[PDB]
Design a protein around this motif. Structure first.
Motif, PDB file in Angstrom:
ATOM      1  N   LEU A   1      39.551  30.942  33.990  1.00 15.24           N
ATOM      2  CA  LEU A   1      39.983  31.444  32.636  1.00 15.24           C
ATOM      3  C   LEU A   1      40.333  32.955  33.017  1.00 15.24           C
ATOM      4  O   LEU A   1      41.253  33.750  32.455  1.00 15.24           O
ATOM      5  CB  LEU A   1      38.919  31.157  31.521  1.00 15.24           C
ATOM      6  N   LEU A   2      39.302  33.489  33.873  1.00 11.08           N
ATOM      7  CA  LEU A   2      39.377  34.872  34.046  1.00 11.08           C
ATOM      8  C   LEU A   2      40.402  35.426  35.330  1.00 11.08           C
ATOM      9  O   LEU A   2      41.360  36.236  34.886  1.00 11.08           O
ATOM     10  CB  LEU A   2      37.972  35.422  34.254  1.00 11.08           C
ATOM     11  N   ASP A   3      40.035  34.969  36.286  1.00  9.15           N
ATOM     12  CA  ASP A   3      40.806  35.222  37.573  1.00  9.15           C
ATOM     13  C   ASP A   3      42.148  34.552  37.528  1.00  9.15           C
ATOM     14  O   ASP A   3      43.067  35.367  37.812  1.00  9.15           O
ATOM     15  CB  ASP A   3      40.165  34.812  39.016  1.00  9.15           C
ATOM     16  N   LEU A   4      42.316  33.319  37.317  1.00  3.92           N
ATOM     17  CA  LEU A   4      43.585  32.798  37.711  1.00  3.92           C
ATOM     18  C   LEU A   4      44.501  33.129  36.482  1.00  3.92           C
ATOM     19  O   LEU A   4      45.636  32.652  36.627  1.00  3.92           O
ATOM     20  CB  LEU A   4      43.378  31.165  37.911  1.00  3.92           C
ATOM     21  N   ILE A   5      43.962  33.388  35.287  1.00  3.33           N
ATOM     22  CA  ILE A   5      44.805  33.211  34.053  1.00  3.33           C
ATOM     23  C   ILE A   5      44.859  34.753  33.300  1.00  3.33           C
ATOM     24  O   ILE A   5      45.906  35.395  33.227  1.00  3.33           O
ATOM     25  CB  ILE A   5      44.069  32.342  32.970  1.00  3.33           C
ATOM     26  N   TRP A   6      43.691  35.178  32.813  1.00  5.61           N
ATOM     27  CA  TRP A   6      43.829  36.329  31.876  1.00  5.61           C
ATOM     28  C   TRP A   6      43.771  37.746  32.891  1.00  5.61           C
ATOM     29  O   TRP A   6      44.479  38.541  32.354  1.00  5.61           O
ATOM     30  CB  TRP A   6      42.650  36.430  31.194  1.00  5.61           C
ATOM     31  N   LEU A   7      43.288  37.781  33.876  1.00  3.75           N
ATOM     32  CA  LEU A   7      43.370  38.927  34.660  1.00  3.75           C
ATOM     33  C   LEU A   7      44.538  39.139  35.518  1.00  3.75           C
ATOM     34  O   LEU A   7      45.379  39.900  35.598  1.00  3.75           O
ATOM     35  CB  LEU A   7      42.252  39.179  35.974  1.00  3.75           C
ATOM     36  N   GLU A   8      45.271  37.786  35.523  1.00  3.92           N
ATOM     37  CA  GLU A   8      46.570  37.721  36.075  1.00  3.92           C
ATOM     38  C   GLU A   8      47.499  38.138  35.097  1.00  3.92           C
ATOM     39  O   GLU A   8      48.690  38.953  35.007  1.00  3.92           O
ATOM     40  CB  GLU A   8      47.013  36.446  36.431  1.00  3.92           C
ATOM     41  N   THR A   9      47.140  37.704  33.730  1.00  2.00           N
ATOM     42  CA  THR A   9      48.041  37.897  32.601  1.00  2.00           C
ATOM     43  C   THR A   9      48.211  39.482  32.104  1.00  2.00           C
ATOM     44  O   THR A   9      49.397  39.950  31.996  1.00  2.00           O
ATOM     45  CB  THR A   9      47.833  36.908  31.446  1.00  2.00           C
ATOM     46  N   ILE A  10      47.035  40.152  32.393  1.00  2.00           N
ATOM     47  CA  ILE A  10      47.155  41.572  31.614  1.00  2.00           C
ATOM     48  C   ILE A  10      47.963  42.437  32.646  1.00  2.00           C
ATOM     49  O   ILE A  10      48.713  43.080  32.322  1.00  2.00           O
ATOM     50  CB  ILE A  10      45.753  41.762  31.221  1.00  2.00           C
ATOM     51  N   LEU A  11      47.375  42.623  33.810  1.00  2.00           N
ATOM     52  CA  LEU A  11      48.115  43.506  34.550  1.00  2.00           C
ATOM     53  C   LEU A  11      49.154  43.223  35.518  1.00  2.00           C
ATOM     54  O   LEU A  11      50.380  43.410  34.962  1.00  2.00           O
ATOM     55  CB  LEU A  11      46.840  44.162  35.746  1.00  2.00           C
ATOM     56  N   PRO A  12      49.353  42.233  36.167  1.00  2.00           N
ATOM     57  CA  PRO A  12      50.336  41.825  37.095  1.00  2.00           C
ATOM     58  C   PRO A  12      51.566  41.160  36.473  1.00  2.00           C
ATOM     59  O   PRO A  12      52.695  41.465  36.700  1.00  2.00           O
ATOM     60  CB  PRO A  12      49.943  41.153  38.367  1.00  2.00           C
ATOM     61  N   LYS A  13      51.144  40.034  35.739  1.00  2.00           N
ATOM     62  CA  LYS A  13      52.213  39.246  35.211  1.00  2.00           C
ATOM     63  C   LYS A  13      52.957  40.061  33.818  1.00  2.00           C
ATOM     64  O   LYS A  13      54.215  39.753  33.625  1.00  2.00           O
ATOM     65  CB  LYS A  13      51.567  37.909  34.618  1.00  2.00           C
ATOM     66  N   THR A  14      52.337  40.823  33.205  1.00  2.00           N
ATOM     67  CA  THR A  14      53.143  41.513  32.178  1.00  2.00           C
ATOM     68  C   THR A  14      53.706  42.583  32.829  1.00  2.00           C
ATOM     69  O   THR A  14      54.956  42.675  32.336  1.00  2.00           O
ATOM     70  CB  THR A  14      51.839  42.254  31.337  1.00  2.00           C
TER      71      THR A  14
END
Ligand SMILES: CCCCCCCCCCCCCCCCCC(=O)OC[C@H](COP(=O)([O-])OCC(O)COP(=O)([O-])OC[C@@H](COC(=O)CCCCCCCCCCCCCCCCC)OC(=O)CCCCCCCCCCCCCCCCC)OC(=O)CCCCCCCCCCCCCCCCC
Ligand SMILES: CCCCCCCCCCCCCCCCCC(=O)OC[C@H](COP(=O)([O-])OCC(O)COP(=O)([O-])OC[C@@H](COC(=O)CCCCCCCCCCCCCCCCC)OC(=O)CCCCCCCCCCCCCCCCC)OC(=O)CCCCCCCCCCCCCCCCC
Ligand SMILES: CCCCCCCCCCCCCCCCCC(=O)OC[C@H](COP(=O)([O-])OCC(O)COP(=O)([O-])OC[C@@H](COC(=O)CCCCCCCCCCCCCCCCC)OC(=O)CCCCCCCCCCCCCCCCC)OC(=O)CCCCCCCCCCCCCCCCC
Ligand SMILES: CCCCCCCCCCCCCCCCC[C@@H](O)O[C@H](CO[C@H](O)CCCCCCCCCCCCCCC)COP(=O)(O)OCC[N+](C)(C)C
Ligand SMILES: CCCCCCCCCCCCCCCCC[C@@H](O)O[C@H](CO[C@H](O)CCCCCCCCCCCCCCC)COP(=O)(O)OCC[N+](C)(C)C
Ligand SMILES: CCCCCCCC/C=C\CCCCCCCC(=O)OC[C@H](COP(=O)(O)OCCN)OC(=O)CCCCCCC/C=C\CCCCCCCC
Ligand SMILES: CCCCCCCC/C=C\CCCCCCCC(=O)O[C@H](COC(=O)CCCCCCC/C=C/CCCCCCCC)COP(=O)(O)OCCN
Ligand SMILES: Nc1ncnc2c1ncn2[C@@H]1O[C@H](COP(=O)(O)OP(=O)(O)O)[C@@H](O)[C@H]1O
Lengths: 98, 55, 459, 320, 122, 49, 44, 347
Positions: free
Chosen positions: B1-14
């Protein structure tokens, strides 16, 4: 300033606008470029005559010389565009994008 | 939930998604001088009003 | 400092003019010789740093880091020459050249007198590392890893550049001695808050701070073995060294600007340690462990006490040795079975006993067994944190438990049980691999006898 | 003074060398017709330079020492196994056809360079203009795919548009049963396997596309099997041709300068042969590519530029 | 935006005024000159590598000319750079001297009489 | 070995080599003389020697 | 076991007229190999 | 085109630029621009095809519009002061018109649309000329009238240039359009520091011209204009792709490479004039240029793309023509950061 000066600057603005807003024909835009030059010639001549800068009486002639060169350059390119497409339309030249 | 999804979503994927959208908006021009020149007129009008009236 | 630097540069044409079958021998011999010469920077005056010249200086903070760099180069050469055997002579020379340029940039960064030179070298380290990862990386995923490693780092370091040039315009100098002697308090204003952030975030992303750590599993897992070794042992310590240097101009603002970073580092310590418990990849597990250890170092630097700075120095050195050893141990098995999955090969103690001993010792230093220097650093940081607030013991205590858990989990999964029946290509350990493990381990054990050397300037 | 703009400025011109027997000539015909003997005889009579038909190792003939290289470092195709297994799923057939088109393009550049630099004429066996008959034959026999034909047409469209077609096109005409007779009497165990439909396809492509097409910009001289041993008579037929038809009379010094700058610089000639169109038959993967290139660079005279390989006896390398 | 272009008594295209000769010339072993020579050597090596010639051996006259050209130009570059910095310092000192009311000398205190704020670390 | 011209053959172009070496030598002697003159003029202007 | 190198399907991501193809730029075609467009049959 | 005619036209382009650079009279500067454009139009169409014709037509229209505007600004300036000398403009409206005319001549955003199209439409030699030599004249004119210019308009156009260069470059597979968007972003960097220090503008221009010459010469040497066509060069000329890789990183602005020096010098100068915010934006945005340079380096040098069978024939032939200044250009594009204090010789 004088009313005459305002009218000449308006002529330049109108021709500039005409050049900027294209229709179908290229020749019309070339005409607008010529119109801009004509208004620049008139404006500079009026300013030069009014202030009696004697030596500057030759610069409108130079202006005309370069205007002729630009006009000749424009017509050459139109010849090549028309030879390619059989028409001088702006829409045809859309091969290259951004 | 945190490393693979949301920390990915907020900084690099955005960042990737936004720059990808802006690149598509900026670079997809049809190459018609009519459209480019029309914008030049808009730009010229704006500068001589919101920049030339301000001094 | 020139005596250490010129020979390192010399290493470059020595390897470019060597015979095709002698590159590894020559590079290893003269790398070891350079490491020996460097060993002489550990003599420190006491009251102040040794200033060789206007451009370079060595500290008690600096001396341990330089010796670790120079010592890591020959180990990287030993670890590389196996998987690079099929490579052409020119590409092998290019790989060695990358490693040498990296060593050269690192030595200069640690000893530069002023921040702009430190910044330039600290950023120059990016190019050889990126080339190593993306050109010699085994997997397709290496390209993505390279981009993550580059962009995360530059997004932090460019505001630092702006802040540094602004600071030199307002102060007149960026020389570290002048910076220290003419230090003045930072007021509590929005301008100073953003100056603090711009001075801190680059080193935070280098550590890495939890939540800005996503580049590290990618880059450390997708890199070749020597790339991973230098990324974990030395390149993470650039953030700690830079933060320890830069926090002298940041007082008294740090008193409350440190709160979110302390919260992130403590909770993310717990988080990354827990992540290590459910990991299917063996390199991924070692990477997250590095993250957990560097969170401890971030806490130590943020609370700004002499005991915390001593603990941070000791932990940086010990982590650099242990993490490199663990990466090399994983790479030996990967070389055998060509997969990173941890449950693929099991019961390896039955097939490779001495390598199992190396595994046990590396796992014991990873969980900080006394009286290793890993525990010295961890204990000093934990005491300083206790003084900072008595409630930190709960988080610190929890972290110690989870670390023991995943360390012994890795050991038990890879070495114990019964061997996978199908894999029959597990050959005896080479002398090269055993010597590589010993050259990691012997120095760590030797360091326990003389703890003060790795303690730092505060000592 | 290497030929370039500076050489053209001061002096050098092409038209002052062209002397009425320049006449690029090509002698075409189906498989195992006697076009080669006729070509050699025409060249010897008229005093022109002869070019034996471009094969798999034509490029080797022109670089290094003129010795051929191994098939895996040069060509990577086999004419024998095209006869044995024309439908093999390793793409040998279209690989062979594409390599042979590239070889003929290189030879056409070499022949035009000779003509434009020395004024002396040339005689070719086939050309980039007649190469397509084999392609169409292979495609009608189910030997290559539709995509291979499309790729061939792309490469041809961007390469053959740069040159001047031949002055004279000589076609030696031999019916297909005579062709099969000559094939069996020759002895080659692979050529024995050539079917009649394949030769018929080659001949149909010739007579319905190549000759009608060349007859618009070139003058064509057809000859049956028996009237082709008379080399004196063919040379007499060529000496009384009025070449007033194609683009050659429309060529002044500047077009010749552009063409002469193009026909030297073989890399510029071969530029579009390796276009990034990924056909399985001609695409080579990174690992094999790397291996084969490394092996090429270890050939005894190939590691450095021509005059710089001391393994081959070169001297004064330090001073060159 | 153009600080030194309009300076008085400046010849348009000299590159080296006569006043520059009052300054010590750079030594011939100046490390900046050695770096310029190293740049010329790298240019020679890249030249050999591009033309597929042996990299360290092929053209020694050519590599010598590369190094010599780089060193030759770098000498004059260093002279001009040192001269421009000398001009900057000359002008700055003269300006500080002629405008004393903008650069005042105030009495400085010893740290025993300056009250500094103390911030405990805890 | 090689089939045709190979414009640089076994011997090097002695004209080009001579001109290159002469250019290098002339540049070096000009630079030495320039540096000597610079040092002397600088010492003369400030009264060192 | 060998290092992974790009193959045809990987390389073809860079073969379109544009990266990031949308619905509109999907019908853009890459320019000719030489920069020469086929002449138009605009019969005068 | 006859070689003598081509030489005469290149000399006329250069002499028009030099006329712009040596003149004291506004009319002679205008004449220099006119002469430059007149001789430059044929150089774009040297290799005739419809794309080259379209590129030359778009170029002529843009540059002639800019010329008319420039002349109008000169005439208004004369109207409000009987002056022909190029010093500091007397009228604010004339200065706005002049700034926009020179921005159109340079291709700064929002007038940037022409640069990618014209660059894609011409050959690599004409692209080299268009992106290196065609910048000197308007930049010199802007350097002369720098005190007069309004900072708000200039910095707006510069920040737009950086942003739009990055975003537009992200989407390209053609190498000429990548180079054009790179040029747009670089121009933004040069003009952002202009109202503060024209020496930094000159330094940025020199380093950009060196790196652009190196890149274009490397692209000519390996006759490639697309990404996939450049993906083959490793299987014929690996040294070329390695040198291109290092030149690409220098363009990105990464230290210790030369390309980093202009960015470093510009940020520092701006901070002196109490401008922290503009520079933070500029560097964080140049990250985009670095991204698509890195993508090109991935496809060209750091990995190996598949190749074709006909490459074996090319293995047997050396390059017919060799560029004399290519080796020097690469060294100056990469290894010149230790010589940074030499910028004082530029003022
Ligand atoms: C405390 C005892 C004191 C003894 C005095 C002499 C000690 C000399 C040893 C020198 C250092 C050891 C080198 C380590 C690498 C091993 C090399 C190897 O491969 O062995 C092959 C060799 C050949 O056997 P083999 O038949 O061919 O097959 C071997 C198989 O692979 C498998 O065979 P194996 O299953 O037998 O495995 C080999 C062995 C080796 O594996 C190891 O793990 C040995 C290393 C211990 C743990 C390392 C990390 C823990 C952090 C502690 C740091 C202390 C360092 C202090 C300075 C040391 C200087 C080097 O593993 C073990 O036996 C289990 C290890 C558990 C040890 C737990 C002890 C915790 C701390 C104890 C006190 C430490 C402070 C001392 C002072 C305190 C206050 C007075 O086997 C051995 O020789 C056995 C090694 C001897 C065991 C040493 C354990 C205690 C010593 C610790 C450091 C010494 C302190 C001296 C100060 C004076 C007190
Ligand atoms: C400072 C700022 C930083 C640097 C500035 C930026 C650098 C950008 C420069 C780009 C130049 C473009 C170029 O020349 O070719 C691109 C070229 C790429 O082309 P390529 O692939 O090699 O092959 C092209 C072939 O040439 C294909 O063409 P081709 O087959 O026709 O070959 C003909 C070739 C071979 O040439 C010949 O055949 C020679 C025959 C001589 C014919 C006689 C004609 C003379 C009659 C005309 C007189 C006109 C006078 C004008 C009167 C004006 C009155 C107001 O000629 C040329 O290639 C061009 C000749 C260039 C002439 C240079 C002479 C300087 C003129 C100075 C004018 C100023 C006068 C005073 C001004 C006073 C103010 C008003 O780039 C390079 O080769 C390397 C780049 C070198 C750049 C310079 C290095 C940096 C600075 C050191
Ligand atoms: C900061 C601390 C100090 C740093 C120093 C500054 C940095 C280094 C200097 C830079 C410039 C120098 C070299 C430039 C020319 C190199 C071109 C080349 O192709 O080299 C091949 C050539 C070897 O080829 P070969 O012997 O003919 O036979 C090989 C086969 O034919 C097979 O050969 P092949 O051609 O067929 O193989 C093709 C190969 C060819 O690929 C290359 O060679 C790459 C060359 C790119 C040039 C880089 C641009 C300019 C330099 C910028 C450096 C930037 C540094 C900052 C960070 C960025 C990192 C790059 O490409 C590949 O295989 C694809 C691999 C792709 C991997 C990606 C890596 C590409 C970029 C890596 C750049 C790393 C920096 C340069 C490392 C040294 C390179 C020699 O190199 C040499 O043998 C000579 C190297 C130096 C020897 C001279 C030493 C001086 C004399 C000895 C006495 C010592 C003096 C002191 C006296 C003490 C008292 C007793
Ligand atoms: C995932 C990992 C990312 C890395 C983590 C980065 C951490 C950055 C967080 C910065 C720490 C604190 C920043 C500033 C300290 C106090 C902030 C503020 O809220 O405090 C009050 C400030 O009052 C208000 O809160 C104003 C700020 C509110 C506006 C900010 C928006 C915050 C929303 C959260 C957005 C997330 C930011 C991070 C983006 C990823 C204090 O009251 P006051 O004494 O008057 O102000 C002190 C400053 N003075 C002295 C100059 C006056
Ligand atoms: C990437 C590195 C950049 C390379 C730049 C090209 C280097 C080769 C160019 C050839 C050198 C000769 C140029 C000058 C020779 C004599 C002409 C001399 O008289 O010019 C004077 C001026 O001298 C030149 O400007 C100095 C040129 C030196 C350029 C190199 C500095 C590069 C900065 C740091 C990088 C280190 C480069 C390493 C060298 C290879 C005229 O002064 P002035 O007319 O009043 O100023 C005009 C401009 N103003 C009015 C607006 C101020
Ligand atoms: C206001 C403007 C500010 C400008 C900030 C620029 C940030 C620099 C990062 C640039 C990232 C660009 C990514 C992009 O454009 O595309 C996403 C890319 C497209 O793939 P292509 O290779 O182009 O095509 C393949 C198919 N043919 O998709 C991906 O998978 C991206 C993978 C790598 C992304 C790396 C992002 C790392 C970012 C780290 C955090 C900091 C970034 C910078 C902003 C920091 C926050 C303020
Ligand atoms: C890989 C991810 C890393 C992301 C790091 C991003 C945060 C970096 C820290 C902040 C960056 C910008 C700081 C600016 C550099 C310092 C310069 C400075 O101190 O000058 C200030 C100026 O301060 C500013 O202008 C800064 C305002 C912010 C502008 C840019 C906003 C970008 C986003 C800000 C919040 C993000 C920072 C934390 C994010 C961390 C990463 C998640 C005071 O100078 P004066 O103007 O003279 O004021 C007094 C005289 N009147
Ligand atoms: N473009 C080509 N494609 C396939 N095969 C070719 C091609 N060109 C020549 N060949 C082969 O060359 C062989 C002999 O060449 P040919 O000219 O027909 O007879 P000769 O040996 O008398 O010159 C033939 O078996 C033919 O298949």
């Amino acid at each position: 300033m004088p009313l005459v000066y305002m009218n000449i600057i308006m002529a330049f603005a109108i021709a500039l606008a005409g050049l900027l807003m294209y229709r179908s024909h290229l020749m019309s835009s070339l005409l607008c470029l010529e119109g801009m030059m004509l208004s620049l010639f008139i404006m500079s001549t009026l300013i030069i005559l009014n202030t009696h800068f004697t030596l500057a009486n030759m610069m409108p002639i130079i202006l005309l010389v370069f205007a002729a060169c630009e006009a000749a350059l424009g017509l050459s390119l139109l010849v090549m565009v028309s030879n390619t497409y059989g028409t001088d339309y702006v829409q045809n030249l859309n091969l290259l994008q951004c | 939930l945190l490393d693979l999804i949301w920390l990915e979503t907020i900084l690099p994927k955005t960042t990737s998604f936004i720059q990808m959208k802006m690149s598509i908006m900026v670079s997809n021009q049809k190459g018609l001088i009519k459209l480019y020149f029309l914008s030049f007129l808009i730009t010229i009008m704006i500068s001589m009003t919101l920049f030339n009236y301000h001094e | 400092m020139l005596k250490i630097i010129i020979p390192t540069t010399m290493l470059l044409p020595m390897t470019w003019m060597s015979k095709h079958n002698m590159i590894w021998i020559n590079a290893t011999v003269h790398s070891l010789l350079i490491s020996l010469i460097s060993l002489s920077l550990l003599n420190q005056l006491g009251e102040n740093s040794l200033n060789f010249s206007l451009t370079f200086f060595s500290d008690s903070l600096s001396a341990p880091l330089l010796v670790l760099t120079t010592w890591l180069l020959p180990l990287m050469l030993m670890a590389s020459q196996s998987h690079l055997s099929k490579e052409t002579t020119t590409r092998k020379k290019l790989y060695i050249t990358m490693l040498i340029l990296l060593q050269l940039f690192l030595i200069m960064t640690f000893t530069a007198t002023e921040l702009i030179l430190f910044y330039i070298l600290f950023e120059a380290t990016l190019v050889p590392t990126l080339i190593i990862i993306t050109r010699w990386g085994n997997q397709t995923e290496r390209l993505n890893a390279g981009l993550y490693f580059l962009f995360y780092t530059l997004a932090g370091s460019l505001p630092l550049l702006v802040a540094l040039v602004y600071i030199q315009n307002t102060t007149g100098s960026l020389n570290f001695l002048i910076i220290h002697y003419w230090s003045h308090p930072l007021s509590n204003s929005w301008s100073n808050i953003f100056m603090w952030l711009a001075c801190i975030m680059a080193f935070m992303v280098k550590m890495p701070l939890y939540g800005l750590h996503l580049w590290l599993p990618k880059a450390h897992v997708e890199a070749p073995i020597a790339g991973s070794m230098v990324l974990a042992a030395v390149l993470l310590k650039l953030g700690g060294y830079g933060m320890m240097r830069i926090t002298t101009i940041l007082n008294p603002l740090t008193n409350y600007m440190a709160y979110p970073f302390l919260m992130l580092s403590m909770w993310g310590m717990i988080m990354t340690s827990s992540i290590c418990l459910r990991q299917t990849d063996l390199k991924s597990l070692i990477a997250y462990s590095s993250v957990s250890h560097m969170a401890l170092v971030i806490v130590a630097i943020m609370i700004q006490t002499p005991w915390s700075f001593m603990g941070a120095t000791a932990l940086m050195i010990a982590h650099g040795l242990t993490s490199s050893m663990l990466f090399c141990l994983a790479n030996t098995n990967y070389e055998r079975v060509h997969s990173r999955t941890m449950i693929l090969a099991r019961g390896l103690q039955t097939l490779l006993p001495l390598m199992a001993t190396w595994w046990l010792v590396a796992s014991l230093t990873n969980l900080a067994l006394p009286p290793s220097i890993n525990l010295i650093g961890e204990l000093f940081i934990i005491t300083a944190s206790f003084s900072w607030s008595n409630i930190t013991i709960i988080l610190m205590g929890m972290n110690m438990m989870i670390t023991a858990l995943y360390s012994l989990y890795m050991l038990i999964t890879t070495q114990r049980g019964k061997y996978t029946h199908h894999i029959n290509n597990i050959k005896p350990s080479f002398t090269r691999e055993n010597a590589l493990m010993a050259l990691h381990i012997l120095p760590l054990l030797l360091l326990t006898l003389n703890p003060k050397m790795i303690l730092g300037p505060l000592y | 003074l290497q030929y370039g703009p500076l050489a053209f400025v001061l002096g050098e011109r092409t038209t002052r060398k062209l002397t009425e027997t320049s006449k690029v000539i090509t002698v075409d015909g189906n498989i195992c017709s006697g076009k080669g003997r006729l070509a050699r005889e025409i060249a010897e009579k008229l005093g022109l330079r002869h070019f034996p038909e471009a094969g798999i190792h034509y490029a080797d003939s022109t670089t290094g020492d003129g010795k051929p290289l191994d098939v895996q470092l040069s060509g990577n195709c086999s004419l024998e196994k095209f006869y044995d297994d024309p439908k093999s799923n390793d793409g040998n057939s279209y690989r062979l056809q594409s390599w042979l088109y590239a070889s003929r393009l290189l030879q056409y550049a070499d022949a035009l360079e000779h003509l434009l630099s020395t004024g002396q004429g040339v005689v070719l066996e086939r050309s980039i203009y007649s190469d397509f008959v084999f392609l169409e034959a292979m495609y009608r026999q189910g030997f290559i795919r539709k995509q291979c034909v499309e790729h061939y047409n792309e490469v041809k469209k961007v390469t053959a548009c740069e040159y001047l077609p031949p002055h004279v096109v000589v076609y030696v005409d031999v019916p297909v049963p005579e062709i099969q007779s000559r094939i069996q009497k020759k002895g080659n165990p692979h050529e024995m396997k050539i079917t009649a439909a394949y030769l018929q396809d080659i001949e149909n492509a010739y007579k319905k596309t190549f000759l009608p097409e060349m007859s618009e910009k070139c003058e064509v001289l057809q000859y049956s099997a028996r009237e082709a041993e008379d080399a004196e008579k063919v040379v007499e037929d060529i000496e009384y041709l009025k070449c007033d038809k194609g683009p050659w009379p429309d060529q002044d010094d500047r077009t010749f300068h552009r063409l002469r700058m193009l026909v030297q610089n073989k890399l510029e000639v071969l530029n579009y042969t390796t276009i990034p169109v990924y056909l399985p038959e001609i695409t080579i993967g990174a690992h094999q590519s790397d291996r084969v290139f490394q092996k090429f660079t270890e050939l005894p005279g190939r590691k450095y530029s021509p005059g710089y390989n001391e393994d081959v006896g070169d001297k004064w390398i330090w001073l060159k | 935006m153009t600080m030194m272009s309009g300076r008085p008594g400046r010849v348009p295209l000299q590159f080296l005024p006569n006043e520059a000769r009052s300054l010590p010339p750079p030594k011939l072993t100046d490390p900046r000159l050695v770096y310029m020579g190293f740049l010329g050597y790298c240019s020679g090596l890249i030249d050999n590598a591009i033309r597929r010639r042996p990299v360290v051996s092929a053209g020694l006259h050519r590599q010598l000319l590369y190094v010599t050209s780089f060193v030759f130009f770098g000498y004059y570059l260093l002279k001009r750079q040192d001269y421009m910095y000398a001009l900057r310092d000359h002008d700055m000192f003269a300006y500080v001297k002629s405008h004393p009311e903008d650069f005042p000398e105030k009495d400085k205190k010893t740290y025993g009489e300056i009250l500094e704020e103390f911030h405990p670390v805890r | 070995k090689f089939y045709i011209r190979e414009p640089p053959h076994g011997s090097p172009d002695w004209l080009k080599v001579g001109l290159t070496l002469g250019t290098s030598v002339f540049l070096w002697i000009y630079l030495i003389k320039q540096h000597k003159e610079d040092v002397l003029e600088y010492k003369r202007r400030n009264g060192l020697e | 076991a060998r290092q992974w190198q790009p193959d045809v399907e990987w390389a073809e991501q860079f073969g379109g007229a544009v990266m990031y193809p949308t619905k509109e730029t999907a019908h853009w075609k890459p320019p000719p190999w030489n920069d020469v467009d086929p002449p138009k049959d605009t019969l005068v | 085109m006859n070689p003598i005619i081509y030489t005469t036209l290149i000399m006329t382009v250069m002499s028009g630029t030099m006329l712009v650079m040596i003149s004291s009279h506004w009319l002679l500067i205008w004449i220099g621009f006119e002469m430059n454009l007149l001789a430059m139009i044929p150089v774009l169409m040297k290799n005739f095809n419809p794309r080259a014709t379209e590129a030359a037509t778009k170029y002529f229209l843009t540059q002639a519009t800019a010329s008319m505007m420039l002349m109008m600004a000169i005439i208004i300036n004369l109207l409000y002061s009987g002056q022909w000398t190029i010093t500091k403009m007397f009228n604010p409206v004339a200065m706005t018109m002049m700034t926009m005319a020179l921005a159109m001549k340079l291709g700064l955003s929002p007038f940037h649309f022409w640069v990618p199209e014209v660059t894609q439409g011409i050959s690599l030699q004409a692209g080299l000329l268009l992106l290196t030599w065609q910048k000197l004249a308007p930049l010199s004119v802007l350097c002369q009238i720098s005190q007069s210019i309004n900072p708000n308009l200039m910095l707006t156009m510069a920040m737009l240039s950086i942003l739009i260069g990055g975003w537009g470059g992200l989407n390209q597979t053609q190498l000429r359009k990548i180079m054009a968007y790179s040029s747009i972003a670089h121009m933004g960097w040069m003009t952002a520091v202009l109202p503060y220090n024209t020496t930094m503008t000159i330094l940025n221009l020199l380093i950009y011209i060196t790196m652009t010459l190196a890149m274009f010469m490397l692209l000519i040497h390996s006759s490639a204009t697309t990404t996939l066509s450049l993906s083959h060069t490793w299987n014929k000329m690996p040294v070329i792709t390695s040198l291109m890789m290092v030149t690409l990183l220098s363009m990105g602005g990464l230290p210790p490479l030369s390309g980093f020096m202009p960015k470093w010098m510009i940020i520092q100068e701006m901070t002196k004039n109490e401008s922290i915010i503009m520079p933070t934006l500029m560097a964080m945005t140049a990250l985009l240029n670095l991204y698509f340079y890195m993508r090109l380096a991935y496809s060209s040098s750091l990995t190996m793309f598949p190749s074709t069978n006909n490459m074996k024939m090319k293995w047997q032939f050396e390059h017919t023509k060799q560029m004399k200044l290519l080796p020097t250009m690469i060294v100056l594009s990469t290894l010149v950061l230790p010589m940074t204090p030499a910028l004082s010789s530029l003022n």
